Design a protein around this ligand. Sequence first.
Ligand SMILES: O=c1[nH]c2ccccc2n1C1CCN(CCCC(c2ccc(F)cc2)c2ccc(F)cc2)CC1
Ligand SMILES: O=c1[nH]c2ccccc2n1C1CCN(CCCC(c2ccc(F)cc2)c2ccc(F)cc2)CC1
Lengths: 234, 234
Amino acid sequence: SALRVGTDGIYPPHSFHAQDGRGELTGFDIDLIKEVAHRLNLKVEFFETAVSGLITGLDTNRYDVLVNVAITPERQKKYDFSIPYIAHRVLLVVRSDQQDIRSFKDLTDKTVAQILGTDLSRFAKELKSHLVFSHNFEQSLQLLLSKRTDATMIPDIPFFNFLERRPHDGNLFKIADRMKDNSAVAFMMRKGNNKLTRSINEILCAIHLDGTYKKIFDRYFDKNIISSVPGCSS
Amino acid sequence: SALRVGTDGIYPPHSFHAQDGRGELTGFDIDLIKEVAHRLNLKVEFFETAVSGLITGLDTNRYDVLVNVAITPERQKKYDFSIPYIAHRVLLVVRSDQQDIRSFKDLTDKTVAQILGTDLSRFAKELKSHLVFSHNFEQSLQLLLSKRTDATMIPDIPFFNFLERRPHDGNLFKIADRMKDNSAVAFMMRKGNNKLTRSINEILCAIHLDGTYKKIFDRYFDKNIISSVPGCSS
Ligand SMILES: O=c1[nH]c2ccccc2n1C1CCN(CCCC(c2ccc(F)cc2)c2ccc(F)cc2)CC1
Ligand SMILES: O=c1[nH]c2ccccc2n1C1CCN(CCCC(c2ccc(F)cc2)c2ccc(F)cc2)CC1
């Protein structure tokens, strides 16, 4: 009788460990679901797995929520999302020196860092890019920096997180494209968790209504740069 | 076998009638659910009632969807919302001449136009305001203009709609307060329509992904002034 939350804890600021990776699990999503869990009156047990096994871990019932999941028609068929609680916009980031990559269409025939088992990996593959698989967003970016790849497609959130922690690197990159729309991020439960979904929804609304959402989002993102979703009424 | 959508058709640009109130039902929400309906492969039958009976009409099974419903904890207990498809921010509007209404707390002991049977009506009443009940947002505004009331709390959407249709009337007001957050607006179905909800959700995602949402929202609101929700991925 706890909320079994899957993550991979190497993705600041969503889900990372304090004290330079050595301490307790922390992050925007983590504090949120933990916050969610407390009001729902439930202990939380985490399970850190690699992203490539994340959804697996949910089909295979080894936990009940995933966090930081982009809403997708594909997933919306097979799963239940909570209400969106944050949004990302997907950037095509390159080295500032970069020349010929001006849109996603241009990723064909260039070398790209994407995280194996992610839609952006499947995208980069579709475009007939040359994939170099990273184990999270820090490495995706470090690979771009190390000339090992020419580009990566990464959300705004991790990528501006990176410009914070490592600010001298905030000049060594550039955004050469973003997606037309931004994308909703929601918790993801197996289909049928109808009951648990709505509770999450109610508590998220409470968390919005009483200032909590604002404290939590404020602890992690720059309000001028990352997009929140709408709040609740009453 | 059709999607029974309740509305009140005197609320531009959400749900109004073409040709100055003489023609077919039209509006942002209306086109959307109609659009939703077509993809879900369903005719749509409308039912115009007054706002005060709207939720009644849904408890009483005389229709299956309400549109332009603000999410609230209260309603989220008793109903199913779709994913949010737009947001409003609630303005405290007064005559430009006004001086002493600087916040919601200041509505106590002044005379307010709100629409009977609405949360904002219940708000104005709680604050110990002096209520003068309007039929819709146009009259609530016209009552403010006619000195019959000192203020109204109204969403941004209707109120900027009004400044559009009637630009000669659009300098004679001012915003003396808005709420902390903006609020999510969603379709509202009876509890249990679990299946229909998710479908609406899938189609809303499709409607986002392929530019539809953008055409529809563009026909009705100013993108710089009204808030959209986040889009979908893929
Ligand atoms: O549809 C999309 N457009 C995208 C544009 C950019 C990046 C991903 C994008 N996706 C999805 C790609 C795969 N994914 C798997 C779930 C894990 C989720 C997560 C993250 C951290 C955590 F702790 C627990 C669960 C996650 C989110 C972003 C990721 F890059 C990788 C994995 C969800 C998002
Ligand atoms: O939560 C909120 N904040 C508010 C600020 C002002 C007034 C009401 C506000 N309510 C609720 C109050 C009552 N109500 C019942 C249905 C009317 C609904 C509607 C309108 C037109 C239509 F065609 C179908 C259904 C509606 C939705 C948004 C509005 F701005 C006004 C009325 C739902 C929204």
